[PDB]
């Protein structure tokens, strides 16, 4: 049951740590069927971390390794931090350096599930808020065309206001909301108020006829 | 979202224009009604 | 300021012809007709043997901002309604 | 003479950039003796946020702290008298009354608590702050307290009836320091909207607004004589003249950054505790730095912890008590056997480039 | 120079400049003893009138323990006697009093100039 | 190098509007008061109807140019980079911010 | 799209209920204030559209783009006297911000009201603001050809900024114009001022060398070598 | 009791209700203080012209750094303006002292067995197993030095 | 090891010297009582 790592599952885990972070391992194993959050954590901290050191052995490294393994006998997690390398590679070379003295059918559905889960970031509250917002506008679009179809018959039915949730709920449409008038200045805005009012009454006359 | 840090604290300016209630609290009962003055 | 409050603005024809009028003060009487916020309800009678209590319906701030009395809400000068005043000006 | 007024005919003859500079060269600052460290007191389990001295006499000072307690220290010997519990969160201001034996203490647990200093127990307590309070200033001759905190409103408490009598509403941010004066303007407040307000508690509104600071006016301190306050934003300390709101003088506060605390001696030694650990002594009359000093942090502690958080002088004026963020109290002592010679301090050298004056 | 005053009247140069820079020995006096008492007696009478307003309006009967008939209405025609109604001690006092919330307008007649100084400013890209 | 402070950039944009205003006066050349009230303290300035229109049209046109310059910059910003994996536009936007920090 | 006024009247209610809801929970976020203030301009109701900016100024009056946008909102609808009162409040609240001073200018430049910018400049240079202001003010009078007026500016400008690059800026002004009688009079005033205000120690050794050299190389171009030689001996004896 | 009830019936209840601190909201209010003090000391050391946008970023550096202290990760931000690193190290040492003192204080209270919550026993197991491994990780490092 | 100029004394205080019921201000008695 202890399975081997395919390169498909290898790419899910790298995309998982790229989004979730290196500490949320049960988040990672949810995408990754058949594998454990312990096993997911173990491979990223032993194989898949790009900070890790999988390369050739300079003779300084080989002299340093045979020094450390002589001075710290069999402390491979200790030596691998001194060598800044993964540990079983450090054992593998020490095994090899002493030998010098010689005498898609399913996986894609997992990947299609993982591709959709990584690209969906909201949760219950945002998705429900989206759904209620779409359904509220759909109710609004329906109610407006009702009034238009009744206006096709010539019978006029006004739009209903939204109901007050609480006692002092404000009809913002009804009045200037919290009218902070500008401070009284000296430069005599008398002709300018007449021209806005003439322009604003002109704008309301155009909306009744041509409709914006 | 729904779980936010504060951009500002609740100011006392808004609570000053409200009308009071006059509810009677247990810790605002009269107690230590006499000041002691230093010599 | 709850301890420093203006005297009420009431008309002459609201008070009538008699010299001394006994007025009752209630410190938070009714709420304003206009601003829906409480005030000092004054109420009084023209004569002693009258049968109609004349109350102050609006607060002093709403009576100041319109320059009307609190009782009959006519303008303090000219004694005309507000709608006719703003049409004459 | 200064030919300038003969050739460059002005309209005021004071408002030139040179005329002011000529006068300022002419006067000399009063010489003040330098200060040195006397005694280092440890003991708190957190930072020290506020220190107040006993008004009547000088035996003790109380050191409100960040381990929520208040410890009482003997001024003379340096020993520890007792400890005052009773705040769940850290103590932001402590003020002892001269007229009566009450220690008002305040915290950011939204509590203003009186203490009977005959009994060492909590008395009354005060209620009404929306958020954690930062200041207590005891009014002299009226039995009031001015408290303010993050609410942006100053709550004027009655002492006897526990009623928040007047509430002052002018500010746009958390209020950092509040001082009580005995005449109009009775309350001097400083908040993080870079304003200092001079209040009129009978009208309940501001007499004078002081917008001269660039940033959060973090500390003020009253001068025990001469009827003036000094206010400090992050890099400029300005002495304000009350009953006019006039700007008396601009100190050479440049290059200091976040001045946490201010204290004023009777001798016009002004103190400016730095968040960098650099503590600077200014002559109050001239606004001149005459000493700059840096503390040691501790045996082992962080390099950011070297910072002064709160300060006061004693009643005599020859001791400076600074509670610092290294979890310690330092007692600064004005160095005797120092004549004008031997230690003039820093040289009286202004520059017109920094246009402070 | 047709409108010399009417630009930014509330700000002057004199507000920027210090006053101790002309003489370091300028005397700002401490308030006199005759002046602190006129301010204490006015303030203590105003605060005590506020504490008595808070206690007399509370519904606790144990609050009177710790504590005008004349204003010419119009002019010269009516002298008004103002009395208090003996209220029913069971019906609630302050009938128009409720716990309602109000937002307050800010009355601003004058602009306070924000009197900073200076235009260094060089930015080392750091910060 | 550095950024430009808001005093200098205020001056430079002041000069740019002066140069553009001068070229408008040059192009207008090639193609060819104050009363204060007695009753109130209010002041009245006689203006031509032109140059008020010209200022309003210029401010609108400058707003149009900056709007379309940023809009075309929006178009380039979402068409250039495609190396790193993202989820939405805001991911690439924020990861362009981490590339600017490097 | 909106067909009649009643559909518009419902359209305005739903947006205003939306924006005021986010502004109630966030008194801050000036970008939200402007976008709702920009919305009321699109509805052509300027009385409302002034009010959201006025309410936004009561939150943060130190936010400069809020000032510039509301100034521009009054300009785009041709309300110039509403903008003049507003710009007056912008500079009287925040005198230090240069942008609010330059914003009042280019509008009055665009109206060709040259007496009003001159009255602005006189007030704005009375507050001692900095070298960017006077340089834009001497560049204004060059545009207006008022050579007597600009000479008066440098008279004050050296007395706001006493330093050689303000004195030598006034000599590059005069030597641009070749008026020899005025130029040495500027030169005489510059070197006497360094001499009589010697004790103040406000011009450095490198700073006074530029005045003496730029005096002397000017006189060599005026073919009077004996005055250019004689001032060197006076300057080295006055400053050894 | 009934005087409060009927005046609540006839007038509604007060809009101005302010919550005093208790045991449940102690650490929550300790956060709101700790956010505001770091807001002030960093907004005072900025150059000039930004208030709302850096507050998001710089306090997330604190929250990340407080997590890194709790996790014994050294918290190296690569290009960090060193006065701000002095600030965030200063307040996290301040929060460390409150966090460690409450851990010692509640552990003596549990051993006495005098009215500790059921939750607070598990919270104190969490804090002491953080501190035991920190003492372990420190002891490993100074042995290797 | 000498944490300051060595003129400065360093003192580490862990316990309260005087009892908590020590008054910390003398209560003012104007008349002597023998009750
Ligand atoms: Zn009313
Ligand atoms: Zn009437």
The 3-state secondary structure of chain D reads CCCHHHHCCCCCCCCCCCHHHHHHHHCCCCCCCCEEEEEEEECCCCCEEEEEECCCCCCEEEEEECCCCEEEEECCCCCEEEEECCCCCCEEEEEECCCCCEEEEEECCCCEEEEECCCCEEEEEECCCCCCEEEEEECCCCCEEEEEECCCEEEEEECCCCCEEEEEECCCCCEEEEEECCCCCCEEEEECCCCEEEEECCCCEEEEEECCCCCCCCEEEECCCCCEEEEECCCCEEEEECCCCEEEEECCCCCCCCEEEEEECCCCEEEEEECCCEEEEEECCCCEEEEEEECCCCCCCCCCCCCEEEEEECCCCCEEEEEECCCEEEEEEECCCCCCCCCCCCCCCCCCCCCCC
Q: Can you tell me the distance from the alpha carbon of D200 to that of D206, in angstroms, rounded to the nearest whole number?
A: 6
Check if B19 contacts A (Cβ < 8 Å): no
CA distance G52 to G35: 10
- Among residues H130, H144, H123, the alpha carbon closest in space to that of H26 is found at H123
Task: Give the up-direction half-sphere exposure of residue E7: CA atoms within 13 A in the CB hemisphere.
Answer: 25
CA distance D214 to G215: 42
Taking an 8 Å cut-off on Cβ atoms, the answer to whether E112 and G93 are in contact is: yes
Angle (nearest 5°) at CA C70 between C65 and C76 = 65
Q: Comparing C-alpha atoms, which of B13, H38, H37 is closest to residue D134?
A: H37
Q: Contact D227/E29, CB-based, under 8 Å? A: yes
- Return phi, psi of residue D208, to 5°: -140, 135
Distance between CA atoms of residues G166 and G169, nearest Å: 5
User: Minimal Cα–Cα distance from D216 to chain G, Å?
Assistant: 14
D74: left (phi over 0), alpha (psi -120 to 50) or beta: beta
CB D196 within 8 A of CB D208: no
How do strand D70-74 and strand D80-84 relate by DSSP bridges? antiparallel
| H or E, element range at C26 | strand C20-26
Chains C and H touch (3+ CB pairs under 8 A): no
Angle of CA points F5, F9, F11, to nearest 5°:
120
Under 8 Å CB pairs connecting chains C and E tally to 67
CB G90 within 8 A of CB G66: no
d(CA F50, CA F28): 12
For C30, E53, E102, H16, the CA distances from H8, given in Å and listed in that order, are 18, 21, 19, 14
Set of chain D residues whose Cβ sits within 8 Å of the Cβ of H97: 45-46, 66-67, 327
Closest partner residue to F43 (CB to CB) among E6, E119, E122 is E6
Query: Among all residues of chain G, which has the CA nearest to that of E103?
Result: G24
Distance CA G7, CA G17 (A): 16
Shortest alpha-carbon distance between residue G36 and chain B (Å): 20
Helix (H, G, I), strand (E, B) or coil at C55: strand
Chains that touch A (3 or more CB pairs under 8 A): B, E, F, G
Domain range list for chain D: 16-357
Residue G119: which H helix or E strand, with range?
helix G114-124
User: How are beta strands D228-232 and C54-55 bridged, if at all?
Assistant: unpaired
Chains H and B are touching, with contact defined as 3 or more CB–CB pairs separated by less than 8 Å: yes
Is C68 in a helix, a strand, or coil?
strand
CA distance H6 to B23: 10
Distance of CA G33 to the CA centre of its chain: 28
The 10 Å Cβ neighbour count of residue G92 is 19
Chain E nearest CA to D156, separation (Å): 10
Say if residues D213 and D194 touch (Cβ distance below 8 Å). yes
The 3-state DSSP class for residue C38 equals strand
CA D140 to chain centre: 17
D169 contacts D201 by C-beta, under 8 angstroms: no
Q: Which residues of A touch F (CB under 8 A)?
A: 15, 18, 118-119, 121, 186-188
| Interface with chain H: mutation pick from B14, B22, B23, highest number of H CBs within 10 Å | B23
Q: Chains meeting G at 3+ CB pairs closer than 8 A?
A: A, B, D, E, F
Is C77 in a helix, a strand, or coil?
coil
User: What's the distance, Cα to Cα, between the start and end of chain H in Å?
Assistant: 68
Spatial separation of the C-alpha atoms in residues A122 and B2, rounded to whole Å? 12
Chain H residues touching residue D131 (CB < 8 angstroms): 32
Torsion-angle region of residue G78: left (phi > 0), alpha (psi -120 to 50) or beta?
A: left
Interchain touch E–H (≥3 Cβ pairs closer than 8 Å): yes
Question: Which of these, A35, A46, A44, lies nearest to A110 by C-alpha position?
Answer: A35
Q: What's the rounded Cα separation, in Å, for the pair A113 and A16? A: 13
Closest CA to A176 of G55, D113, F6: G55
8 Å CB contact of D79 and I17: yes
Q: How far is E24 from F94, CA to CA, in rounded Å?
A: 57
Radius of gyration of chain C (CA): 13
Cα separation, C76 vs C85, in Å, equals 11
Chain E residue with Cα closest to B32: E66
The sheet carrying D196-200 orders its strands as: D175-180, D187-191, D196-200, D205-210
Chain C interface, best mutation among E48, E52, E78, by max C CB count within 10 A: E78
I13 close to D41: Cβ distance less than 8 angstroms: yes
Measure H19 CA to nearest chain E CA, in Å: 18
CB within 8 A of A73, min separation 6: which ones?
Answer: none
> Coil, helix or strand for C21?
strand
Chain H residue closest to B21 (CA)?
A: H14
- DSSP-assigned letters across all residues of chain H: -HHHHHHHHHH---TT--PPP-STTHHHHHHHHHHHHHHHHHHTTS-SS-SSHHHHHHHHHHHHHHHHHHHT-----SS--HHHHHHHHHHHHHHHHHHHHHHHHHHHHHHHT-S--HHHHHHHHHHHHHHHHHHHHHHHHHHH-
Q: Give the C-alpha separation, C55 to C59, whole Å.
A: 11
Whether A185 and G89 lie within 8 Å, measured CB to CB: yes
**In the structure, do chain G and chain A come into contact, i.e. share 3 or more CB pairs under 8 Å?**
yes
Nearest CA in chain B to G26: B7
Q: Is the dihedral of CA G54, G55, G61, G63 positive or negative?
A: negative
Sketch the domain layout of chain C as residue ranges: 4-89
- B/e letters for C2-41, b = 16+ CB within 10 Å, e = fewer, are eeeeeebbbbeebbbeeeebebbbbbbbbbbeeeeebbbb
CA distance H109 to C9: 68
- The three-point CA angle D262-D264-D265 to 5° equals 145
Tell me the resolution in Å: 3.9
Q: How far apart are CA H8 and CA A56, in angstroms?
A: 81
How far does the centroid of ligand 1 lie from the alpha carbon of residue C65, in Å?
9
Name, in order, each residue with C-beta under 8 angstroms of H104's C-beta and a sequence gap of 6 or more.
none
CATH top-level class of D16-357: mainly beta
How crowded is the C-beta side of D221, counted as CA atoms within 13 Å? 25
The backbone torsions φ and ψ at residue D183, rounded to the nearest 5 degrees and listed phi first, read: -130, 180
Q: What share of chain C is helix, strand, coil (3-state, %, to 5)?
A: 20, 20, 60
- Does any CB of chain I come closer than 8 Å to the CB of residue D121? no
CA-to-CA separations, D61 to D77, F81, I22, in angstroms, rounded: 12, 65, 16
Domain ranges of chain F: 1-102
Q: How far is CA H126 from the centre of its chain?
A: 15
Nearest CA to D250 among D292, D193, D277, D212?
Answer: D212
User: Taking CB atoms and an 8 Å limit, are E59 and H12 in contact across chains?
Assistant: no
Q: In this structure, is the dihedral angle defined by the CA atoms of residues I25, I27, I28 and I29, taken in order, positive or negative?
A: negative
Alpha-carbon span G61 to G129, nearest angstrom: 21
- Chain B residue at shortest CA distance from G59: B8
Judge whether B28 and D160 are in contact, CB under 8 Å: no
Which of H3, H10, H15, H54 to mutate to test binding with chain E, by most E CBs within 10 Å of its CB? H10
Sheet holding D35-42, edge to edge: D308-313, D319-324, D328-334, D35-42, I9-11
User: Which CA distances in Å does D296 have to A86, D70, E91?
Assistant: 44, 24, 70
Q: Rounded CA gap, A71 and A87, in Å?
A: 17
Taking the C-alpha atoms of residue F9 and residue D353, their distance in angstroms, rounded to an integer, is 23
- F43 near F35, Cβ under 8 Å? yes
Name the residue in chain I with its Cα closest to that of B37: I28
Omega prior to D185 cis, within 30 of 0: yes
What is the distance between the alpha carbons of residues H56 and H61, in angstroms, rounded to a whole number?
9
> 10 Å Cβ neighbour count for D310?
26
Alpha carbon separation from C86 to B29, C33, C75 (Å, rounded):
53, 20, 11
**How far off is chain D from I26, nearest CA to CA, in Å?**
7
Sort strands I9-11 and D35-42 into parallel, antiparallel or unpaired.
parallel
Q: What is the CA radius of gyration of chain B?
A: 19
- Which of D51, D108, D60 has the alpha carbon at shortest distance from D262? D51
Measure the CA angle with vertex G34, ends G28 and G36; round to 5°.
100
Beginning with the edge strand found earlier in the chain, give each strand of the sheet holding C20-26 in spatial order. C54-55, C41-44, C20-26, E79-84
Residue G116 and residue G102: Cα distance in Å, rounded? 13
Are B24 and H32 within 8 A, CB to CB? no
3-state SS assignment for residue E92:
coil
User: Which residues have CB under 8 Å from D7's CB, separation 6+?
Assistant: G189
CA of residue C67 to ligand 2 center, whole Å? 11
Counted across chains E and H, CB pairs separated by less than 8 A come out at 26
Chains D and B touch (3+ CB pairs under 8 A): yes
Backbone angles phi, psi at G63, to 5 degrees: -95, 105
Chains that touch H (3 or more CB pairs under 8 A): B, D, E
For residue D166, the cross-strand partners are D156
Cα-flanking dihedrals φ and ψ of residue G67, to 5°? -70, -45
Measure the CA–CA gap between G29 and G8, rounded to whole angstroms: 27
> Cβ contacts of residue D268 below 8 Å, gap of 6+?
D30, D32, D223, D283, D284, D285
Terminal CA-CA length for chain I = 58
Question: Hey, are the CB atoms on D305 and H36 less than 8 Å from each other?
Answer: no
Helices (H) and strands (E) in chain G, counts: 13, 0
Most E CBs within 10 A among A176, A179, A183, hence the mutation to make, goes to A183
Determination technique used? cryo-EM
**B21 and H13 Cβ atoms separated by less than 8 Å:** yes
List the chains bordering chain C where 3 or more Cβ pairs fall under 8 Å.
Answer: E
Between the alpha carbon of residue D292 and those of residues A72, D328, D344, E92, G72, the distances in Å are 54, 20, 13, 67, 50
What distance in angstroms lies between residue C36's CA and the mean position of ligand 1's atoms? Answer: 6
Interchain CB contact of H14 with E (< 8 Å): yes
Tell which residue, D254, D134, D257, has the closest CA to residue D190: D134
Order of strands across the sheet that contains D121-126 = D91-96, D103-107, D112-116, D121-126
Minimal CA separation from I29 to chain D, in Å: 12
CA distance C42 to chain E (A): 9
- Rounded CA separation D306/D277 (Å): 5
Cα A158 from Cα A199, distance rounded (Å):
26
H28 to chain B: nearest residue by CA? Answer: B5
Separation between Cα atoms, residue D16 and residue D19, nearest integer Å: 5
DSSP string, B1-39: ------SSPPPHHHHHSSPP-----STTS--S-S-----
User: Rounded CA gap, D194 and D192, in Å?
Assistant: 5
Question: Following DSSP, what letter does each residue of F33-95 receive, concatenated?
Answer: --EE-SSSS-EE----STTTHHHHHHHHHHHHHHHHHHHHHHHHHHHH--SS--SSHHHHHHH
DSSP reduced 3-state for G231: helix
Which three-class secondary structure string do you get for chain A?
CCCCCCHHHHHHHHHHHHHHCCCCHHHHHHHCCCCCHHHHHHHHHHHHCCCCCCCCCCHHHHHHHHHHHHHCCCCHHHHHHHHCCCHHHHHHHHHHHHCCCCCCCCHHHHHHHHHHHHCCCCCHHHHHHHHHHHHHHHHHHHHHHHHHHHHHCCCCCCCCCCCCCCCCCCCCCCCCCCCCCCCCCCCCCCHHHHHHHHHHHHHHHHHHHCCC
Angle separating helix axes G164-177 and G131-144, nearest 10 degrees = 10
Distance CA E76, CA E70 (A): 13
Q: What residue of C is the nearest CA neighbor of E52?
A: C3
E106 touches chain B (CB under 8 A): no
Residues whose CB falls within 8 Å of the CB of residue E49, separated by 6 or more in sequence, listed in order:
C3
**What radius of gyration do chain E's Cα atoms show?**
28
Burial class (CB within 10 angstroms; exposed 0-12, middle 13-18, buried 19+) of E65: exposed
Report which secondary-structure segment, H or E, holds C23.
Answer: strand C20-26
CB D309 within 8 A of CB D46: no
Looking at the complex, report in whole angstroms how far the Cα of residue I35 sits from the nearest Cα belonging to chain D: 21
D29: Cβ–Cβ under 8 A, 6 or more apart, which residues? D283, D285, D286, D288, D290, D348, E24
Is G105 within 8 Å of E127 (Cβ atoms)? no
Please list the residues that pair with D53 across neighbouring strands.
Answer: D61
Q: Interhelix angle for A87-98 vs A59-71, to 10°?
A: 100
With H, G, I as helix, E, B as strand and everything else as coil, classify residue G97.
Answer: coil
For residues G70 and G37, the answer to whether their CB atoms sit within 8 Å is yes
Distance in Å from the first CA to the final CA of chain G: 85
Q: Residue H75 Cα, ligand 1 centroid: separation in angstroms?
A: 61
Q: Are D260 and D216 in contact (CB under 8 A)?
A: no
- Within 150-209 of G, beta carbons closer than 8 Å to F belong to none
Residue F46: closest CA among chain G residues belongs to which residue? G113
């Amino acid at each position: 049951k202890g399975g081997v790592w395919t390169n498909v599952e290898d790419q899910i885990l790298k995309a998982a740590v790229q989004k979730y972070g290196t500490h949320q391992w049960s988040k990672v194993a949810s995408l990754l069927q058949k594998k454990t959050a312990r096993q997911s954590e173990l491979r990223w901290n032993e194989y898949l971390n790009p900070k890790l050191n999988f390369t050739e052995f300079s003779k300084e490294e080989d002299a340093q390794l045979l020094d450390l393994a002589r001075e710290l006998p069999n402390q491979w997690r200790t030596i691998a931090d001194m060598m800044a390398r993964p540990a079983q590679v450090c054992v593998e070379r020490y095994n090899r350096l002493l030998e010098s003295e010689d005498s898609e059918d399913e996986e894609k559905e997992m990947l299609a599930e993982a591709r959709a889960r990584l690209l969906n970031t909201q949760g219950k509250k945002a998705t429900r808020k989206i759904r209620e917002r779409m359904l509220e506008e759909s109710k609004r679009i329906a109610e407006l065309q009702k009034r238009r179809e009744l206006k096709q018959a010539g019978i006029n039915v006004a739009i209903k206001k939204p109901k007050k949730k609480y006692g002092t709920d404000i009809d913002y449409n009804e009045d200037i909301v919290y009218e902070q008038a500008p401070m009284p200045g000296i430069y005599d805005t008398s002709t300018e108020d007449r021209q806005i009012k003439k322009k604003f009454e002109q704008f309301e006359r155009k909306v009744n006829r041509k409709g914006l | 979202t729904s779980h936010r840090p504060q951009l500002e604290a609740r100011s006392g300016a808004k609570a000053a224009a409200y009308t009071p209630t006059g509810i009677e609290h247990a810790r605002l009962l009269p107690g230590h009604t006499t000041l002691k003055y230093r010599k | 300021d709850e301890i420093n409050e203006p005297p009420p603005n009431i008309c002459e024809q609201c008070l009538g012809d008699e010299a001394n009028i006994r007025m009752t003060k209630i410190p938070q009487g009714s709420e304003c007709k206009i601003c829906t916020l409480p005030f000092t309800l004054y109420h009084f009678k023209t004569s002693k043997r009258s049968n109609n209590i004349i109350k102050t319906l609006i607060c002093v701030r709403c009576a100041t901002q319109r320059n009307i009395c609190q009782c009959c809400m006519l303008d303090s000068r000219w004694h005309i309604p507000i709608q006719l005043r703003d049409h004459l000006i | 003479s200064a030919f300038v007024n003969k050739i460059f005919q002005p309209e005021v003859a004071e408002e030139l950039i040179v005329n002011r500079y000529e006068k300022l060269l002419s006067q000399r600052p009063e010489w003040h003796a330098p200060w040195k460290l006397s005694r280092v007191i440890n003991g708190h389990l957190g930072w020290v946020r506020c220190v107040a001295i006993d008004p009547v006499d000088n035996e003790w000072f109380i050191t409100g702290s960040n381990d929520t307690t208040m410890k009482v220290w003997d001024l003379a010997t340096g020993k520890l008298k007792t400890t005052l519990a009773g705040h769940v969160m850290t103590v932001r201001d402590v003020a002892v009354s001269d007229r009566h034996p009450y220690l008002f203490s305040v915290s950011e647990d939204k509590t203003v608590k009186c203490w009977d200093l005959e009994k060492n127990q909590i008395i009354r307590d005060y209620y009404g702050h929306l958020s954690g309070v930062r200041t207590v200033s005891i009014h002299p001759t009226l039995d009031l307290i001015a408290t303010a905190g993050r609410d942006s409103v100053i709550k004027l408490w009655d002492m006897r009836t526990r009623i928040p009598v007047i509430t002052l509403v002018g500010h746009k941010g958390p209020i950092n320091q509040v001082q009580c004066t005995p005449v109009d303007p009775q309350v001097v407040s400083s908040s993080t909207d870079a304003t200092v307000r001079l209040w009129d508690v009978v009208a309940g509104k501001t007499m004078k607004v002081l917008t001269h600071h660039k940033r959060s006016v973090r500390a003020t301190a009253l001068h025990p004589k001469e009827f003036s306050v000094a206010s400090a934003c992050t890099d400029d300390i300005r002495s304000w003249g009350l009953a006019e709101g006039s700007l008396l003088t601009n100190f050479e506060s440049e290059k200091t950054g976040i001045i946490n605390t201010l204290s004023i001696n009777q001798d016009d030694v002004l103190f400016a505790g730095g968040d960098n650990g650099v503590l600077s002594f200014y002559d109050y009359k001239s606004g001149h730095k005459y000493q700059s000093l840096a503390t040691r942090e501790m045996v082992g502690s962080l390099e950011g912890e070297r910072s002064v958080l709160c300060s006061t002088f004693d009643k005599t004026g020859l001791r400076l008590i600074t509670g610092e963020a290294d979890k310690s109290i330092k007692i600064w002592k004005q160095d005797e056997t120092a004549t004008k010679e031997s230690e003039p301090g820093l040289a009286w050298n202004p520059n017109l480039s920094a246009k402070r004056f | 120079a047709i409108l010399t005053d009417q630009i930014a009247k509330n700000v002057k140069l004199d507000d920027f400049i210090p006053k101790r820079q002309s003489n370091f020995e300028l005397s700002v006096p401490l308030p006199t003893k005759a002046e602190i008492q006129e301010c204490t007696a006015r303030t203590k009478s105003y605060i005590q009138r506020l504490v008595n307003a808070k206690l007399a309006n509370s519904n606790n009967r144990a609050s009177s323990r710790y504590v005008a008939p004349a204003n010419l209405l119009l002019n010269n025609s009516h002298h008004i006697e103002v009395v208090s109604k003996q209220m029913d001690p069971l019906l609630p006092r302050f009938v128009g009093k409720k716990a309602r919330k109000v937002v307050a307008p800010t009355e601003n007649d004058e602009v306070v100039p924000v009197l900073h100084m200076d235009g260094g400013e060089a930015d080392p890209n750091e910060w | 190098r550095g950024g430009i402070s808001y005093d200098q950039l205020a001056k430079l944009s002041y000069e740019k509007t002066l140069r553009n205003l001068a070229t408008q006066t040059q192009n207008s050349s090639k193609q060819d008061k104050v009363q204060k009230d007695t009753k109130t303290g209010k002041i009245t300035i006689a203006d031509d109807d032109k140059l008020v229109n010209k200022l309003a049209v210029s401010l609108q046109s400058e707003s149009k140019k900056r709007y379309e310059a940023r809009k075309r910059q929006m178009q380039n910003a979402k068409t250039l980079y495609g190396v790193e994996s993202f989820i939405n536009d805001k991911n690439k936007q924020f990861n362009e911010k981490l590339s600017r920090e490097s | 799209d909106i067909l009649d006024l009643e559909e518009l009247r419902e359209y305005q209610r739903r947006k205003r209920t939306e924006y005021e809801g986010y502004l109630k929970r966030n008194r801050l976020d000036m970008g939200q204030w402007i976008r709702y203030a920009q919305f009321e301009i699109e509805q052509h109701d300027m009385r409302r559209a002034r009010s959201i900016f006025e309410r936004a100024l009561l939150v943060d009056s130190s936010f400069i783009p809020l000032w510039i946008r509301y100034i521009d909102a009054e300009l785009k609808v041709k309300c110039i006297n509403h903008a003049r009162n507003l710009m007056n409040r912008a500079i009287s609240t925040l005198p230090r911000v240069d942008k609010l001073w330059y914003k009042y200018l280019i509008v009055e430049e665009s109206l060709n009201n040259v007496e009003i910018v001159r009255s602005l400049y006189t007030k704005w240079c009375s507050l001692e603001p900095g070298v960017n202001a006077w340089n834009s003010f001497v560049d204004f009078e060059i545009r207006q050809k008022n050579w007597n007026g600009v000479r008066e500016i440098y008279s004050k400008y050296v007395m706001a900024h006493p330093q050689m690059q303000t004195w030598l800026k006034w000599v590059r002004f005069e030597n641009r114009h070749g008026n020899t009688e005025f130029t040495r009079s500027v030169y005489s005033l510059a070197i006497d001022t360094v001499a009589n205000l010697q004790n103040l120690q406000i011009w450095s050794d490198m700073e006074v060398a530029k005045l003496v050299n730029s005096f002397a190389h000017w006189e060599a171009a005026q073919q009077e070598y004996e005055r250019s030689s004689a001032l060197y001996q006076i300057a080295i004896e006055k400053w050894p | 009791y009934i005087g409060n009830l009927i005046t609540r019936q006839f007038e509604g209840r007060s809009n101005e209700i302010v919550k005093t601190t208790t045991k449940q909201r102690l650490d929550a209010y300790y956060d709101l203080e700790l956010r505001n003090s770091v807001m002030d000391d960093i907004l005072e050391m900025m150059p000039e012209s930004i208030r709302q946008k850096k507050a998001r970023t710089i306090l997330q550096h604190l929250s990340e750094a407080w997590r890194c202290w709790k996790a014994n990760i050294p918290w190296d931000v690569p290009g960090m303006p060193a006065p701000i690193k002095k600030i965030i190290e200063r307040y996290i040492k301040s929060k460390a002292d409150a966090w460690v003192s409450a851990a010692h204080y509640n552990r003596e209270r549990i051993k006495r067995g005098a009215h500790v919550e059921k939750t607070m026993v598990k919270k104190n197991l969490g804090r002491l197993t953080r501190l035991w491994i920190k003492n372990e990780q420190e002891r490993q490092r100074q042995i290797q030095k | 090891e000498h944490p300051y100029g060595k003129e400065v004394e360093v003192l580490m205080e862990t316990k309260n010297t005087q009892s908590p019921q020590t008054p910390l201000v003398e209560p003012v008695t104007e008349r002597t009582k023998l009750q």
